[model samples]
Structure formats: structure tokens, C-alpha cells
Target: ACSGRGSRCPPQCCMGLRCGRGNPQKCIGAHEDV
Candidate 1:
């Protein structure tokens, strides 16, 4: 899937996650490339 930041991320990793700051660490840490 594609993030709002123009980055590519897996659907499982970025599922239901928000764009930018305030996102949970679990989601952030889930993808080091994020």
C-alpha cells in the first residue's frame, strides 16, 4: 500500500494507521522504513 507521505508500506504494517506524527510507536516500529 501507499502512505500519504509517498512512501511504500505493507498493508499489514500501515493498516488503519494515520499519516504524520502522533501515530503509535507500534505502527512506527512495525516498519523501520516508515
Candidate 2:
């Protein structure tokens, strides 16, 4: 299953989301990407 915000990111996040960088990468919205 896909991961959601603040969740431990999967190999891939849910549609429209991207994995964010962190000590442990988490799921973030695509709009949040830089």
C-alpha cells in the first residue's frame, strides 16, 4: 500500500505525493516539492 504524509515512505508514495528527505524519508505532497 502507498504511504501518506508523516508515514514511513514506501518504495513509492500515493499518487500526487513524493517521498521527502529526512532521517527516515516520509511522504509529502507534490506541491511541496522544490
Model 2, residue 34: displacement in angstroms? 10
Scored against the true structure, residue 6 in model 2 reaches a CA lDDT of 78
Task: Please give the lDDT score at residue 5 for candidate 1.
Answer: 36
RMSD of each: 7.8, 2.4
RMSD over all Cα atoms, model 2? 2.4
Tens-place lDDT digits, model 1, residues 1-34:
5453334343334554444444332334334453
How much lDDT does each candidate structure score? Answer: 0.40, 0.78
User: Top model by TM-score, which number?
Assistant: 2
Task: Give the TM-score comparing model 2 with the true structure, all chains together.
Answer: 0.62
Candidate 2: misplaced stretches above 4 Å? Answer: 32-34
Displacement of residue 14 (Cα, Å) in model 1 is 0.4
